[PDB]
Amino acid sequence: EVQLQQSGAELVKPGASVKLSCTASGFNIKDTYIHWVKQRPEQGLEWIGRIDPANGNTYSDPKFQDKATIKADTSSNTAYLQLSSLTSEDTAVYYCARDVLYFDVWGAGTTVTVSSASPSVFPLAPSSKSTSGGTAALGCLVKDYFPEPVTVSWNSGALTSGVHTFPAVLQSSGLYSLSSVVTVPSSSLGTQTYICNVNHKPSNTKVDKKVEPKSC
Amino acid sequence: DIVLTQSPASLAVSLGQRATISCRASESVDSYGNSFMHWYQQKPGQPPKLLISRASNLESGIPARFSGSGSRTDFTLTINPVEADDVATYYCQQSNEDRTFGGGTKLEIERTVAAPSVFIFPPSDEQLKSGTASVVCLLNNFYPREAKVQWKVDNALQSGNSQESVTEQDSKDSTYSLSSTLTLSKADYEKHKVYACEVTHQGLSSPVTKSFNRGE
Amino acid sequence: RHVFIRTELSFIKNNVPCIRDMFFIYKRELYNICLDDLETHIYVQKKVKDSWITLNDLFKETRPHIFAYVDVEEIIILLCEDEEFSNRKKDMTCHRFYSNDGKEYNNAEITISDYILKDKLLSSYVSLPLKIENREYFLICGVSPYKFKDDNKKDDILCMASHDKGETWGTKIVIKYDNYKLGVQYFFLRPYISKNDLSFHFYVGDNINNVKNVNFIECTHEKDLEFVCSNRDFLKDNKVLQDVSTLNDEYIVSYGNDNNFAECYIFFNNENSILIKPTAAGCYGGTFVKIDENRALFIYSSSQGIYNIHTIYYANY
């Protein structure tokens, strides 16, 4: 089964350097060319460059600076993107892809966030005001965190239906904030428990807030 | 270099209709009988997925409702008939001279008008102890995206103390969801009693208010 | 046990601007098939003293593909027309030139009906007859312009051969080889033949910048008319592979310092090396021209028609 696993989300203080890993499964990077594409939030796809892992030949776009060094190791089946001295104009999702004269295998992306600093997880309880007979709403509020990668899940992957994880809003305080509602019937509230599993890999925070209903 | 321009920037089609996205190249993208123009689909929070390679080659596993046409500098992606899980940004890309991507074409689905399900959340007691208060109004599954949520505390209209969040259009029911959070201080929260959010939408005959009194 | 290496540098002045040079040795003398376009001519030239002497213009009355074959006492040069790759005829028309000397040739137009290379990329090259059993063959080989992961037929290279000195090309020589790379572009496929052994020299790219990487595959008979080819690694760090030839039953391989070829290295059996340091110019286009099992030339053109000729003698006991 063909694949490209990328490294975990990471915080990166401005001016510091980062090295992402792109690891193949099912094929040898030697028999192909591994490319990197930069995608800024709400922006398009921007081609960075490629390494030909058979000879080590690399080419990065001229307009795209030589602030990205493409590397590879065939014995580990891994390609690297070394981004040095990063600014906020380098906060983007970095994708790695395999090229067979078109991009047919992609990596899930690495969220690169330059962090000057560093998630308060509060419970959005399901009350009788947010209850329409046999329909209800409950969630978690991911308030005041500095790097943007936050990962809200429900019952560790068991609860997926009705889940609405809202995009992040950058507060006046300069810290991101988002809600995560889910629709469930008002019959199984006192029996079924709902825990949100918010993970903030940049600042290394893992919270597991339990959602409990209240008296109106 | 080969520059790619996509028309239109966004498309609004209904289920069952035909959607045609065009991609015009500054130079010919053909070489020895092959047209190096490929099409990708990107859904929010996921990497681009190869749909069509070499102008018309449908990739294995991609539904036959996706087809590509095109000769030297002018290419088209056709989705016919369009389905609910086709909501995504579509990019074109060439591999004739280096690698360049087109701007992107956002595909939005148009459907019948559906009224939202309005809910309201009081601030959590764990957050009230910190010194700040967030009241969350929720608009569940509505179309069109255009909705107006006004905050009213003791019948007074609030302005400048709220932030909104809108999810991506659901891949099954083609509806949107909205979040409005009234951010007040702990001191200003206990000074007032009646907290309501007034939702005005096309699907609503007249604005709907969902209120709660403080203490609960 | 005993190793001899001798190098000598000489110059040749050409009064003709050649867009493409095709060197060959005939009767222990250096020749060139000069393509000149400013007005188009295909001159046959010969090294006399310090200069190139134009003997004939095979383009008297007809940019074509040139397949020159040097036999012991004969020179057979074919000029083949090629139309746009995507609008090609089913029959190939060539002009066959025959000579027992260097100066005088007889022109005869030939047709290769339903030729098997209609979907292949052909390049111009000089070659030798390949002896298969009791027959001597002249080879016209082509390669797929592109190889894709979903290729139906996986043998990129194909050859059509003549065993009547170039009149008919009804023999098909199967070449068993699939490039390691999943998606690749091919360029300048040229067969290298030494002591009845077939090999290929070519370039591989991926439409990135203007990168072309030399590849060399050594081939072995599987059947009389079938060969199994496989990559021969000559990779060196911080050196770009350029040309391959054989002296003393061993490979003699030239490399550039980088893709701009400021200087060139020649490695004998990957054991001994010499450095070619080119007024200020490079060694771009450096080519081996084998004389005998111990002598070879290394030629590259500086200025306009100044040819730097490196005469190499090598022996290993």
The answer on A19 and A56 residing in a single domain is yes
Q: Which residues contact C83 (CB under 8 A, 6 or more apart)?
A: C89
Interface contact flag, C208 A102, Cβ < 8 Å:
no
**CA dist B43 to A1, A150, B40, C23, C88, Å?**
22, 18, 10, 57, 43
Resolution stated for this PDB structure, in Å: 2.7
Type of residue numbered A132: S
Structural domain includes residue A216:
no
What are the phi and psi torsion angles at A151 (to 5°)? -125, 95
Breaks (C-N over 2.5 A) in chain B follow: none
Query: Chains meeting C at 3+ CB pairs closer than 8 A?
Result: A, B
- The torsion angle over the Cα atoms of residues C22, C25, C30 and C36, rounded to 10 degrees, is -20
Structural domain includes residue A190:
yes
What's the residue count for chain A?
216
The whole domain housing B162 covers 117-213
Distance from C-alpha of C159 to C-alpha of C189, rounded to nearest angstrom: 11
Q: With residue B131 as reference, give the H or E element that holds it.
A: none
Angle at CA of residue C53, ends C288 and C79, nearest 5° = 65
- How many structural domains comprise chain B? 2
Chain C residues with CB-CB distance to B99 below 8 A: 208
User: 3-state class of B190 per DSSP?
Assistant: helix
In DSSP terms, which residues pair with C295 in a beta bridge? C292, C313
Distance from C-alpha of C25 to C-alpha of C68, rounded to nearest angstrom: 11
Exposed/middle/buried for residue B186 (C-beta within 10 Å: 0-12, 13-18, 19+): middle
- The torsion angle over the Cα atoms of residues A41, A43, A45 and A46, rounded to 10 degrees, is -90
User: 3-state class of A29 per DSSP?
Assistant: helix
User: 3-state class of A89 per DSSP?
Assistant: helix
Type of residue numbered A176: Y
Nearest residue in chain A measured CA to CA from C258 = A57
Structural domain includes residue A14:
yes
Terminal Cα distance for chain C, rounded: 5
The answer on B143 and B201 residing in a single domain is yes
Tell which of B93, B110, B127 closes a domain: B110
Tell which of B60, B77, B110 closes a domain: B110
Residue linked to tokens 């259009």: B169
Would you tell me how many other CB atoms lie within 10 Å of the CB of residue A177? 23
In DSSP terms, which residues pair with A207 in a beta bridge? A198
Rg (CA), chain C: 19
Token representation of residue A112: 């690169």
The answer on A76 and A19 residing in a single domain is yes
Instruction: Give the closest residue to B151 by CA, choosing from B106, B212, B97, B79.
Output: B212
Chain B residues with CB-CB distance to A143 below 8 A: 127, 134
Tell which of B46, B81, B110 closes a domain: B110
Interface contact flag, A101 C213, Cβ < 8 Å:
no
Type of residue numbered B47: P
The β-bridge relationship of strands C226-231 and C171-176 is parallel
- Is the N-terminal amide bond of B81 cis, ω within 30° of 0? yes
- CA C224 to chain CA centroid, nearest Å: 23
Distance from C-alpha of A97 to C-alpha of A95, rounded to nearest angstrom: 7
Does residue A64 sit at the B interface (CB-CB below 8 Å)? no
The whole domain housing A107 covers 4-114
Distance from C-alpha of C274 to C-alpha of C264, rounded to nearest angstrom: 8
Distance from C-alpha of A106 to C-alpha of B133, rounded to nearest angstrom: 42
Distance from C-alpha of B74 to C-alpha of B121, rounded to nearest angstrom: 52
CB C77 within 8 A of CB C94: no
CB C286 within 8 A of CB C300: yes
Nearest residue in chain C measured CA to CA from B60 = C150
Tell which of A77, A93, A114 closes a domain: A114
Residue linked to tokens 């072309």: C212
Q: Which residues contact B206 (CB under 8 A, 6 or more apart)?
A: none
The answer on B173 and B89 residing in a single domain is no
Token representation of residue B87: 């909501």
The answer on B88 and B145 residing in a single domain is no
The answer on A205 and A181 residing in a single domain is yes
In DSSP terms, which residues pair with A95 in a beta bridge? A37
Instruction: Give the closest residue to A149 by CA, choosing from A66, A188, A77, A205.
Output: A205
Chain B 15-74, residues with CB within 8 Å of chain A CB atoms: 36, 38, 40, 42, 46-50, 53-54, 59
Distance from C-alpha of A15 to C-alpha of B114, rounded to nearest angstrom: 49
CB A197 within 8 A of CB A208: yes
Does residue B144 sit at the A interface (CB-CB below 8 Å)? no
The answer on A41 and A79 residing in a single domain is yes
The answer on A86 and A151 residing in a single domain is no
Would you tell me how many other CB atoms lie within 10 Å of the CB of residue C233? 9
Instruction: Give the closest residue to B69 by CA, choosing from B85, B83, B80.
Output: B80
Distance from C-alpha of A175 to C-alpha of A145, rounded to nearest angstrom: 5
CB C122 within 8 A of CB C112: no
Method: X-ray
The β-bridge relationship of strands C226-231 and C213-223 is antiparallel
Type of residue numbered C278: P
Q: With residue C168 as reference, give the H or E element that holds it.
A: none
Would you tell me how many other CB atoms lie within 10 Å of the CB of residue C74? 15
Q: Which residues contact C201 (CB under 8 A, 6 or more apart)?
A: C188, C189, C190, C191, C192, C214, C215, C216, C243, C244
Distance from C-alpha of C198 to C-alpha of A148, rounded to nearest angstrom: 60
The answer on B138 and B59 residing in a single domain is no
Exposed/middle/buried for residue C85 (C-beta within 10 Å: 0-12, 13-18, 19+): middle
C144: distance to nearest CA of chain B, Å?
A: 9
- Is the N-terminal amide bond of B144 cis, ω within 30° of 0? yes
Residue linked to tokens 């771009």: C284
The answer on B208 and B122 residing in a single domain is yes
Query: For residue B157, how many C-alpha atoms fall within 13 Å in the half-sphere facing its CB?
Result: 5
Q: What does DSSP assign to residue B167?
A: P
Q: Which residues contact A107 (CB under 8 A, 6 or more apart)?
A: A4, A5, A6, A22, A95, A96, A97, B47
Query: Chains meeting B at 3+ CB pairs closer than 8 A?
Result: A, C
> What sign has the CA pseudo-torsion C33, C34, C35, C39?
negative
The answer on B64 and B8 residing in a single domain is yes
Structural domain includes residue A146:
yes
CATH code where residue B150 lies? 2.60.40.10
Chain B residues with CB-CB distance to C207 below 8 A: 31, 36, 95-98
CB C170 within 8 A of CB C159: no
Distance from C-alpha of A48 to C-alpha of C52, rounded to nearest angstrom: 48
CATH code where residue A14 lies? 2.60.40.10
- Is the N-terminal amide bond of C129 cis, ω within 30° of 0? no
C233: distance to nearest CA of chain A, Å?
A: 11
Across the interface, of C181, C209, C235, the residue whose CB is closest to A31 is C181
The answer on A178 and A87 residing in a single domain is no
Across the interface, of B32, B98, B99, the residue whose CB is closest to C145 is B32
Residue linked to tokens 């022109």: C107
What are the phi and psi torsion angles at A41 (to 5°)? -60, 130
CB A118 within 8 A of CB A146: yes
**CA dist B48 to A26, B88, C36, C183, Å?**
20, 10, 49, 20
- How many structural domains comprise chain A? 2
Mutate to test the interface with A, among C144, C209, C241 (most CBs of A within 10 A): C209
Burial profile C142-168: b = 16 or more Cβ within 10 angstroms, e = fewer? bbbbbbbbeeeeeebbbbbbbbebbee
What's the residue count for chain C?
317
The answer on A94 and A16 residing in a single domain is yes
Nearest residue in chain A measured CA to CA from C241 = A55
Token representation of residue B146: 């255009």
The answer on B91 and B19 residing in a single domain is yes
